[PDB]
């Protein structure tokens, strides 16, 4: 029994309609997408940054590793 002991609530009214009287995925353009954008926007500058920094570090370290496998001509300039 967890329904009826939860909280003391007073004066709130709610209106809802049967699933059969309304559309499942309504206003995709007027409401849906705008918010999807809203949400994306609000977050991008919090998430994206450290991932971008992670990328660079990866890129650097990867390339730097290959450069150290290549030969430096300055070791054979007087090997005649």
């Amino acid at each position: 029994i967890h329904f009826g002991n939860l909280a003391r609530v007073r004066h709130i009214i709610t209106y809802s309609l049967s699933p059969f009287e309304q559309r499942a995925i309504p206003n995709i353009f007027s409401d849906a997408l705008p918010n999807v954008w809203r949400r994306f926007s609000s977050q991008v500058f919090k998430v994206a940054p450290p991932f971008l920094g992670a990328y660079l570090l990866y890129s650097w370290g990867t390339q730097e590793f290959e450069r150290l496998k290549r030969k430096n001509p300055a070791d054979y300039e007087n090997d005649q």
Binding site: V9, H11, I12, I13, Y15, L17, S18
Partner: protein, 112 residues
């Protein structure tokens, strides 16, 4: 125009709910209904016969656990409510067929 009886624009029924909650009230009231046929329909007779089968109850009915109304018996046996009533409220072109019961906060679900 003077001796012409105006036809009323029809009212649309909607399956839906409205919950006015106030835990500060002693008991809770719930009413549920489907759309009715309207005065003219013969079916209204059968509908009333139907509500006759379900009937109504209220803590003072002495018949108690022996009432013929099953819902009433259960209501008694399991202390389901303080009272309940069926109804077939008709109107010109529509109506409301349903029930309304009064119960304590913790017996609302079983009653329904």
């Amino acid at each position: 125009k003077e001796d012409a009886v105006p036809i009323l624009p029809r009212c649309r029924f909607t399956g839906s709910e409205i919950r006015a909650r106030d835990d500060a009230l002693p008991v809770a009231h719930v009413a549920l209904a489907v759309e009715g046929p309207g005065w003219a329909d013969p079916d209204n007779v059968v509908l009333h016969v139907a509500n006759a089968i379900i009937g109504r109850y209220d803590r003072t009915f002495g018949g108690g656990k022996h009432l013929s109304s099953r819902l009433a018996a259960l209501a008694v046996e399991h202390k389901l409510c303080h009272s309940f009533q069926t109804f077939n409220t008709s109107y010109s072109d529509t109506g409301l067929f349903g029930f309304h019961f009064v119960a304590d906060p913790l017996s609302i679900d079983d009653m329904m």
